[PDB]
Design brief:
heterodimer; A: 2 strands; about 30% helix; elongated; B: alpha+beta; Helix Hairpins; 1 helix; structural protein; auto-catalytic proteolysis
Chain lengths: ~55, ~45
């Protein structure tokens, strides 16, 4: 099943690069988050990250 | 800061939205300690 997850980060600021997945910062950021998430959900229920979208906060 | 909205996929009959909030909120500090990331708040909906 799929769930909708939303959150805000202060460690990073909104960047034009993040306003477009055409940048490595955006792609890596997803990965870093995906990597970090895998640590939180190690329970195994985790499957992967999909349909990511970023926005200014 | 940045507001991110995505879709998180979990196995069915394994983890509930309630459990997700529990680990994520509990991991906000530790997951943050490991990656040095800062989170303001998290929200998970099944709809």
């Amino acid at each position: 099943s799929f769930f909708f997850l939303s959150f805000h980060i202060s460690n990073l600021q909104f960047n034009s690069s993040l306003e477009d997945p055409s940048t490595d910062y955006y792609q890596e950021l997803q990965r870093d988050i995906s990597e970090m998430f895998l640590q939180i959900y190690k329970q195994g229920g985790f499957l992967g990250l999909s349909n990511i979208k970023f926005r200014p906060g | 800061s940045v507001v991110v909205q995505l879709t998180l996929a979990f196995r069915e009959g394994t983890i509930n939205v309630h459990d997700v909030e529990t680990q994520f909120n509990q991991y906000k500090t530790e997951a943050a300690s490991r990656y040095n990331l800062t989170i303001s708040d998290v929200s998970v909906s099944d709809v």
